Amino acid sequence: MGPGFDFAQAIMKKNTVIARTEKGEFTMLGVYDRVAVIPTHASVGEIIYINDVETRVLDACALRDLTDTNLEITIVKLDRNQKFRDIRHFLPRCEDDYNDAVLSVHTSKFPNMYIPVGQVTNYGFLNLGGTPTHRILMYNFPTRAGQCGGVVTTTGKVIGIHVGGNGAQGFAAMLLHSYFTD
Ligand SMILES: C[C@H]1CN(c2ncccc2F)CC(=O)N1
Numbered sequence: 742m743g744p745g746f747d748f749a750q751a752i753m754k755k756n757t758v759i760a761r762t763e764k765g766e767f768t769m770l771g772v773y774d775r776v777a778v779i780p781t782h783a784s785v786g787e788i789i790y791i792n793d794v795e796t797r798v799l800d801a802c803a804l805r806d807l808t809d810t811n812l813e814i815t816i817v818k819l820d821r822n823q824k825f826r827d828i829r830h831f832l833p834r835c836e837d838d839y840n841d842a843v844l845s846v847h848t849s850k851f852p853n854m855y856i857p858v859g860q861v862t863n864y865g866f867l868n869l870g871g872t873p874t875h876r877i878l879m880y881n882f883p884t885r886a887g888q889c890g891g892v893v894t895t896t897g898k899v900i901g902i903h904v905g906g907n908g909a910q911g912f913a914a915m916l917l918h919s920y921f922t923d
Pocket residue numbers: 883884885
């Protein structure tokens with residue numbers, strides 16, 4: 742509809758795949774080369790399905806901050822024959838608040854879904870399904886099951902991935918430039 746959805750659409754069309762684990766189907770953001778992110782609660786194993794193709798997992802790392810607290814981001818390297826467009830320059834360097842964000846989802850259940858979630862607060866600490874979690878973004882939209890891995894964008898920035906909600910609000914794990922330095 743507007744320049745927010747334009748940027749979101751550009752990311753979804755080139756930098757997402759449909760990831761299936763034993764814990765379900767997730768929106769999965771490809772960041773560069775064969776490196777993608779997914780909520781840690783997807784429980785990535787040795788094998789993952791990527792757009793319904795059996796794919797070896799070459800590496801997977803559940804991120805924690807230096808207080809040894811969950812970040813709910815799993816960085817995955819895929820045995821895929823094709824690289825992602827490099828979008829690391831759209832990642833923020835710092836923890837921040839944002840205006841006018843879009844949450845974008847693409848699964849078998851929710852294809853081509855874009856939600857204007859509005860203002861995004863640096864919420865910080867969240868007890869997420871009973872796990873102390875840091876660097877959480879919050880938006881006042883009543884998000885539902887099927888949206889985990891959803892990409893949260895502003896114009897010009899990919900800021901996080903959807904990891905949960907409480908019926909009234911949704912929560913995203915921050916993405917930071919420092920997570921994907923090579
Ligand atoms: C497909 C399903 C999802 N849905 C949602 N309702 C409320 C919050 C978040 C939602 F995704 C709208 C709808 O028509 N049904």
